[PDB]
Structure formats: structure tokens, C-alpha cells
Design an enzyme around this catalytic site. Structure first.
Site, PDB file in Angstrom:
ATOM      1  N   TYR A 130       0.240  -1.922  -3.702  1.00 52.59           N
ATOM      2  CA  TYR A 130       1.011  -1.588  -2.510  1.00 52.59           C
ATOM      3  C   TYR A 130       1.021  -2.794  -1.563  1.00 52.59           C
ATOM      4  CZ  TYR A 130       2.934   1.448   1.187  1.00 52.59           C
ATOM      5  OH  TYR A 130       3.697   2.045   2.169  1.00 52.59           O
TER       6      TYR A 130
ATOM      7  N   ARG B 224       2.196   4.569   2.387  1.00 47.96           N
ATOM      8  CA  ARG B 224       2.293   5.580   1.342  1.00 47.96           C
ATOM      9  C   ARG B 224       1.143   5.525   0.328  1.00 47.96           C
ATOM     10  NH1 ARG B 224       6.451   8.732   1.322  1.00 47.96           N
ATOM     11  NH2 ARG B 224       8.333   8.231   2.547  1.00 47.96           N
TER      12      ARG B 224
ATOM     13  N   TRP C 203      11.832   2.917   8.328  1.00 45.74           N
ATOM     14  CA  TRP C 203      10.701   1.986   8.253  1.00 45.74           C
ATOM     15  C   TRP C 203      11.173   0.560   7.950  1.00 45.74           C
ATOM     16  CZ3 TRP C 203       6.480   4.019  10.173  1.00 45.74           C
ATOM     17  CH2 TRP C 203       6.222   5.394  10.009  1.00 45.74           C
TER      18      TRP C 203
HETATM   19  C1  LIG Z   1       9.616  -5.022   2.174  1.00 53.15           C
HETATM   20  C2  LIG Z   1       9.923  -4.436   3.554  1.00 53.15           C
HETATM   21  C3  LIG Z   1      11.450  -4.384   3.715  1.00 53.15           C
HETATM   22  O1  LIG Z   1       9.424  -5.340   4.539  1.00 53.15           O
HETATM   23  C4  LIG Z   1       9.222  -3.072   3.744  1.00 53.15           C
HETATM   24  C5  LIG Z   1       9.663  -2.383   5.046  1.00 53.15           C
HETATM   25  C6  LIG Z   1       9.048  -0.991   5.183  1.00 53.15           C
HETATM   26  C7  LIG Z   1       7.527  -1.038   5.105  1.00 53.15           C
HETATM   27  N1  LIG Z   1       6.997   0.309   5.170  1.00 53.15           N
HETATM   28  C8  LIG Z   1       6.392   0.823   6.312  1.00 53.15           C
HETATM   29  O2  LIG Z   1       6.229   0.179   7.351  1.00 53.15           O
HETATM   30  C9  LIG Z   1       5.871   2.217   6.244  1.00 53.15           C
HETATM   31  C10 LIG Z   1       4.713   2.525   6.945  1.00 53.15           C
HETATM   32  N2  LIG Z   1       4.147   3.755   6.948  1.00 53.15           N
HETATM   33  C11 LIG Z   1       4.729   4.733   6.237  1.00 53.15           C
HETATM   34  C12 LIG Z   1       4.159   5.989   6.251  1.00 53.15           C
HETATM   35  C13 LIG Z   1       4.713   7.071   5.544  1.00 53.15           C
HETATM   36  O3  LIG Z   1       4.052   8.267   5.554  1.00 53.15           O
HETATM   37  C14 LIG Z   1       2.686   8.003   5.184  1.00 53.15           C
HETATM   38  F1  LIG Z   1       1.919   8.577   6.134  1.00 53.15           F
HETATM   39  F2  LIG Z   1       2.432   8.393   3.918  1.00 53.15           F
HETATM   40  C15 LIG Z   1       5.862   6.892   4.784  1.00 53.15           C
HETATM   41  C16 LIG Z   1       6.470   5.626   4.759  1.00 53.15           C
HETATM   42  C17 LIG Z   1       5.915   4.544   5.484  1.00 53.15           C
HETATM   43  C18 LIG Z   1       6.471   3.247   5.501  1.00 53.15           C
HETATM   44  C19 LIG Z   1       7.048  -1.762   3.849  1.00 53.15           C
HETATM   45  C20 LIG Z   1       7.684  -3.155   3.753  1.00 53.15           C
HETATM   46  N1  LIG Z   2       8.832   8.530  -2.213  1.00 63.28           N
HETATM   47  C1  LIG Z   2       8.335   7.238  -2.710  1.00 63.28           C
HETATM   48  C2  LIG Z   2       8.832   6.117  -1.797  1.00 63.28           C
HETATM   49  C3  LIG Z   2       8.542   4.707  -2.324  1.00 63.28           C
HETATM   50  C4  LIG Z   2       9.169   3.652  -1.425  1.00 63.28           C
HETATM   51  O1  LIG Z   2      10.334   3.761  -1.038  1.00 63.28           O
HETATM   52  N2  LIG Z   2       8.385   2.624  -1.081  1.00 63.28           N
HETATM   53  C5  LIG Z   2       8.827   1.553  -0.211  1.00 63.28           C
HETATM   54  C6  LIG Z   2       7.669   1.030   0.638  1.00 63.28           C
HETATM   55  S1  LIG Z   2       6.866   2.316   1.607  1.00 63.28           S
HETATM   56  C7  LIG Z   2       9.338   0.366  -0.970  1.00 63.28           C
HETATM   57  O2  LIG Z   2       8.902   0.126  -2.092  1.00 63.28           O
HETATM   58  N3  LIG Z   2      10.172  -0.425  -0.286  1.00 63.28           N
HETATM   59  C8  LIG Z   2      10.520  -1.777  -0.712  1.00 63.28           C
HETATM   60  C9  LIG Z   2      11.881  -1.915  -1.356  1.00 63.28           C
HETATM   61  O3  LIG Z   2      12.581  -0.893  -1.520  1.00 63.28           O
HETATM   62  O4  LIG Z   2      12.265  -3.073  -1.699  1.00 63.28           O
HETATM   63  C10 LIG Z   2       6.835   7.277  -2.770  1.00 63.28           C
HETATM   64  O5  LIG Z   2       6.252   8.089  -2.025  1.00 63.28           O
HETATM   65  O6  LIG Z   2       6.200   6.536  -3.560  1.00 63.28           O
END
Ligand SMILES: CC(C)(O)[C@H]1CC[C@H](NC(=O)c2cnc3cc(OC(F)F)ccc3c2)CC1
Ligand SMILES: N[C@@H](CCC(=O)N[C@@H](CS)C(=O)NCC(=O)O)C(=O)O
Ligand SMILES: CC(C)(O)[C@H]1CC[C@H](NC(=O)c2cnc3cc(OC(F)F)ccc3c2)CC1
Ligand SMILES: N[C@@H](CCC(=O)N[C@@H](CS)C(=O)NCC(=O)O)C(=O)O
Lengths: 199, 199
Positions: free
Chosen positions: B8, B14, B104
Site C-alpha cells: 500500500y 484502506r 481522495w
Molecule cells: C496516487 C494518488 C493519486 O496520489 C493517490 C490519491 C489518493 C490517496 N488516498 C487517500 O488519501 C485515502 C486516504 N484515506 C482513505 C480512507 C478510506 O477509508 C479508510 F478508513 F479505510 C478510504 C479511502 C482513503 C483514501 C492515495 C494516493
Molecule cells: N475498494 C478498493 C479501492 C482500491 C483503490 O481505489 N485504491 C486507491 C488508493 S486508496 C488506488 O489504488 N488509487 C491509485 C490509482 O488508482 O492509481 C479497496 O478497498 O481495495
């Protein structure tokens, strides 16, 4: 035997996976479909204010996929090993994540149509390609037999094809998978008698 | 014993539910955290282009909640009856549905901040109230003992409180539930050694 009552709108939508499972397992149930006019009253009585719900001997279950998973435990639809059950869950959630992106409840038709067409033009082809590659040359999405992940593929793709009829033109293997689900006798029997709704 | 590798970003996000489950069950694993710079390369190698993923003896599982459910099967975190396992799944999905509404990944800070503040001001209080009513006077969300639904409540609420510190001012019973999860020895031990990240 359990006395099941399913409550949802008069549409396939999020209840249809549950309806396919009941059909496949040959389980009789009440398919209660509400009119929009009655929804405000009903909504205020529900712990989380959402449908579908499934009443099982008077006790209320919610969340379509939680319910689907409950109904498939100890059946041939679950997945054959513990890891394949994880794969079933993961494919279902991948499909559900995408369907959940659509603004189904949006009131402004202009922004709604624009957002539907963005998702269908830019995001949908990418997912279809990932699913097609995942499936490869296998008969079903997970393991060596049909699971409720295959059901959910067919349900979700049926709705996407309403808005984007060319969705699977480049994916004959995914078309074949739809046809195989649609040909399962209990599923075919449900498809030919269900109420006909757009969604 | 299985050789687990979790991949991750360097954040709770997540993956944290999986990390709590490994902590509670006393399972050693590799907590592989990637830098944003390495993500493009890695993304192109994954069947669905998303993280978290969990490699189990070299085989790749995806979808955070599918993985969490897999790891909790035949453990005390699953839920004690088949219907309570459905309730666990339903609460987790209710929480996940809401967290999944937040943009996000949105790049424009203006529209992102506006959308965060809309969700936190208008939608979050409603969900908190439904959860509080659901919990009522019970010790844990489902059944008579802790489940991974309680873990996910604590994880999700921890992140919401970063943006809205007053979220639970009207919900002392939900605060108590957070503190009870945070006090479980294996969870407390993880919270005190984990990397410190905003999200
Ligand atoms: C690669 C790029 C574009 O830079 C990404 C942008 C988005 C980024 N993701 C979050 O900031 C984020 C933080 N917290 C979360 C909590 C959630 O619920 C949890 F409590 F499970 C569900 C989704 C969440 C997503 C990861 C990098
Ligand atoms: N419902 C999926 C969501 C997975 C997901 O969308 N992850 C995001 C980060 S939180 C991701 O990989 N984003 C980067 C991208 O799409 O390039 C899970 O819970 O695993
Ligand atoms: C009461 C009010 C405001 O009028 C509602 C508006 C939204 C309405 N919902 C849909 O139109 C709809 C249709 N199909 C779906 C398919 C999905 O994926 C499936 F394939 F499971 C997931 C969600 C879906 C939602 C119900 C009434
Ligand atoms: N993830 C949930 C979603 C439930 C949901 O949001 N249902 C919609 C209809 S598809 C609803 O009840 N909308 C009416 C409202 O919110 O008033 C599930 O799969 O059951």
C-alpha cells in the site's frame, strides 16, 4: 424454512443479485417492490435509511452484497476454496465500486447525463479490459464453476449496456460469460418472468 | 504458516483494517509501503491497477475488505453466528460506502476542500446518528464481542476526525467504542509503533 421478504424499488438495481441467488437456489420469497410515493414513510423506519433490505423471519438485514454473501454461504455459489471465496468477494467489490460511481439519484439531467457519459466513455472501457484479461480463457471468473461473481457481472453489464450498447464489442469472451449465466436454467426462468424495467 | 506481504501507500488509508487484523491475530507480515514515484511502474503490473494488495505465498489478493474478510474467517473477529457475520459485513459496507464518497485523489484543492466540507457538514452527522442509534446501549456493534466491524469504525472515524474534530461531540457512546478498540492490547501495541501519517 426461512420466510424471506425482499424490499426494494420496482427495478433490478441493487436487489437483482439477491433475486438471482433466490432463483438459483430455488428459494421462494416475497419480492416486495415499493412505489417512490411510499418511500419517505418506509425510509424513516430503517436503521440506515437505504434499500434493499431482506427480512428473515421478521429480522431486518441490509446491504445488498452482505445479504448476497449470507445467502450463498454453504452453497455452490460461494467459491470452492477459502481463497477463491476471497477472489469472489474481490471481483464483486471491483464491479460494485464502479457501479457506485454513477450519480443514480442526481436530479439535474444535464450534469447527470454528462457524468454518465464521462464514466461510460473513459472509465468503463478500462474496467472491461481488466475484467477480460482477468478472465482470460477460463470458463467462469473464479474457479472451475459458476459463482455469484458471475451473476453480478451479468447484472452490472446488463445495466451498463442500456447506456452504452457497444460496451462489449471488443470483448467476445465477456459476452460469452453473460450468455452462459443467462442460459443457466433457474436464471433463464427468472429472466423470462421478471418485471421489465429500464434499470 | 502463510508468508504475507501487504502493499500500500505510506498511510493508514484502506490498508489499516488489514494491519489491525494482523496485529490482533499476532500474525507477522511484511508491511510494504510504496512512494508515489514508484506507483506508475507497480500499477501496470496489477490485474486491477489498485492497492492495497496482499501477496499470500506469492499469490496476489486484492480489495481491502475482501482481504480483511478472508483473514478473519474461522477467528473470533468474524462474528459468532451466520446472521451476525452478515451484520458485520453490512456495517463495514455502510462505513465503506461513506468513505468512498470522498474525492481522495482530486487534484484541484478548491473543489476538493469544498466537497470534503460538504460531505463532513451535511452527510457525516446523519451517518453518525444512525450508527449511534444502531449501537444503542450495546458494548460492541455486533453480537457480544469485538469484531472487525468495530475495528473499521475506529479506523474510519480516526480519519474523519482529522478533518472534523467535533464529529463525535454529540455521540459519547461512539467515543467509548473507539476507546475500547484502541485499548485492546494488540491494537494499542500497533497504534503506538505504527508510522505516523496524516491519513
Ligand atoms: C496516487 C494518488 C493519486 O496520489 C493517490 C490519491 C489518493 C490517496 N488516498 C487517500 O488519501 C485515502 C486516504 N484515506 C482513505 C480512507 C478510506 O477509508 C479508510 F478508513 F479505510 C478510504 C479511502 C482513503 C483514501 C492515495 C494516493
Ligand atoms: N475498494 C478498493 C479501492 C482500491 C483503490 O481505489 N485504491 C486507491 C488508493 S486508496 C488506488 O489504488 N488509487 C491509485 C490509482 O488508482 O492509481 C479497496 O478497498 O481495495
Ligand atoms: C428515491 C430516488 C431518489 O428516486 C432513487 C434514485 C436512484 C434510483 N437508483 C437507480 O436508478 C439505480 C439503478 N441501478 C443501479 C445498479 C447498481 O449496480 C447494480 F448492478 F447492482 C447500483 C446502483 C443502482 C441504482 C432509486 C430511486
Ligand atoms: N451499498 C448499499 C447501497 C444502498 C443504497 O444506497 N440504496 C439506494 C437505492 S439503490 C437508496 O436506498 N436510495 C434512496 C435514499 O437514499 O433515500 C447496498 O448495496 O445496499
Amino acid at each position: 424454512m426461512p420466510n424471506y421478504k425482499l424490499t426494494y424499488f420496482n427495478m433490478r438495481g441493487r436487489a437483482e443479485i439477491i433475486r438471482y441467488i433466490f432463483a438459483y437456489l430455488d428459494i421462494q420469497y416475497e419480492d416486495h417492490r415499493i412505489e417512490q410515493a411510499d418511500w419517505p414513510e418506509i425510509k424513516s423506519t430503517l436503521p440506515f435509511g437505504k434499500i434493499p433490505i431482506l427480512e428473515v423471519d421478521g429480522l431486518t438485514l441490509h446491504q445488498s452484497l452482505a445479504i448476497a454473501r449470507y445467502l450463498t454461504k454453504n452453497t455452490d455459489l460461494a467459491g470452492n476454496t477459502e481463497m477463491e471465496q476471497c477472489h469472489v468477494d474481490a471481483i464483486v467489490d471491483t464491479l460494485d465500486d464502479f457501479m457506485s460511481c454513477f450519480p443514480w439519484a442526481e436530479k439535474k439531467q444535464d450534469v447527470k447525463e454528462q457524468m454518465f457519459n464521462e464514466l461510460l466513455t473513459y472509465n468503463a472501457p478500462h474496467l472491461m479490459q481488466d475484467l477480460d484479461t482477468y478472465l482470460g480463457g477460463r470458463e467462469w471468473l473464479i474457479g472451475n464453476s459458476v459463482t455469484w461473481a458471475d451473476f453480478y457481472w451479468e447484472i452490472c453489464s446488463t445495466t451498463l449496456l442500456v447506456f452504452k450498447p457497444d460496451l462489449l464489442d471488443n470483448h467476445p469472451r465477456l459476452v460469452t460469460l453473460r450468455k452462459k449465466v443467462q442460459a443457466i436454467p433457474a436464471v433463464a426462468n427468472w429472466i423470462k418472468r421478471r418485471p421489465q424495467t429500464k434499470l
